[PDB]
Amino acid sequence: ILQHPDGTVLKQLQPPPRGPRELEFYNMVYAADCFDGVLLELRKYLPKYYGIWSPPTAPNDLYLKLEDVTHKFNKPCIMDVKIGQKSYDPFASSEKIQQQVSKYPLMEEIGFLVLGMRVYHVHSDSYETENQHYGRSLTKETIKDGVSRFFHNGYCLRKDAVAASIQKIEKILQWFENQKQLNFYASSLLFVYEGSVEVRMIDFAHVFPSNTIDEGYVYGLKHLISVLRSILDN
Numbered sequence: 001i002l003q004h005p006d007g008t009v010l011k012q013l014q015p016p017p018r019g020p021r022e023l024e025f026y027n028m029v030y031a032a033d034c035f036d037g038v039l040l041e042l043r044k045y046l047p048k049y050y051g052i053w054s055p056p057t058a059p060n061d062l063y064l065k066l067e068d069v070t071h072k073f074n075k076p077c078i079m080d081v082k083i084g085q086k087s088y089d090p091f092a093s094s095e096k097i098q099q100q101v102s103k104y105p106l107m108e109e110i111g112f113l114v115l116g117m118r119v120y121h122v123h124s125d126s127y128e129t130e131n132q133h134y135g136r137s138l139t140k141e142t143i144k145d146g147v148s149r150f151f152h153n154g155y156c157l158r159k160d161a162v163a164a165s166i167q168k169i170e171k172i173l174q175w176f177e178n179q180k181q182l183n184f185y186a187s188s189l190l191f192v193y194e195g196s197v198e199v200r201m202i203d204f205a206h207v208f209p210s211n212t213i214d215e216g217y218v219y220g221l222k223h224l225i226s227v228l229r230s231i232l233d234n
């Protein structure tokens with residue numbers, strides 16, 4: 001992800017088939033002639049899409065030009081959470097499945113995984129960053145405190161941001177409970193609040209057509225909501 005001063009990010013397409021699939025996802029959703037009510041509603045929860053972009057002198061080098069969801073914040077606190085019970089998609093080989101489950105074998109049980117966070121701390125005027133090993137170390141016993149860490153800002157627990165996060169996730173969940181045409185694997189929610197709220201869906205390299213509720217995504221959202229709700233009682 002390259003952050004551009006104009007308030008966009010450039011995401012380089014991942015190698016095939018992932019990058020092409022994510023391109024086609026955005027293209028389908030943001031199709032100019034799209035009057036699909038499900039897909040029109042979905043646009044609210046995605047980064048705004050500005051189309052494919054490549055350097056003037058390098059047509060080979062493919063990027064997605066996306067809204068920088070963090071742009072309107074002064075000191076954004078950012079958390080990336082992968083959603084679902086399965087991080088592998090319906091066409092994964094046995095080895096791929098093993099690889100994906102191996103990465104975090106608690107995915108089925110918990111239904112989400114923290115990919116990272118950047119938390120601005122007022123006292124130090126500095127950022128605390130957690131990498132992918134942070135979230136992959138969290139268990140059922142430590143997930144609540146694991147998530148809570150994100151909201152430690154301003155000499156307090158930011159229950160305002162926690163409550164707002166629940167409210168925004170709830171709308172995304174309502175979307176999922178009213179669609180049966182897309183299933184989402186290894187996609188994320190990006191949480192942003194002001195450290196000095198946004199909750200958006202990102203990362204669509206494994207989005208597939210379906211004829212069922214995305215039950216794994218729904219489970220993940222519901223468990224995430226339940227954890228955040230518990231944090232409100234701290």
Ligand SMILES: O=C(Nc1cccc(-c2onc3ccc(-c4nn[nH]n4)cc23)c1)C1CC1
Nearest residue numbers: 047067068069070078080116117118202203
């Ligand atoms: O700091 C983090 N992430 C971060 C930071 C700054 C900006 C963004 C960001 O803003 N808008 C985005 C739109 C799409 C995507 C995106 N799409 N597929 N992968 N990333 C990322 C985006 C994300 C994580 C916690 C460690």
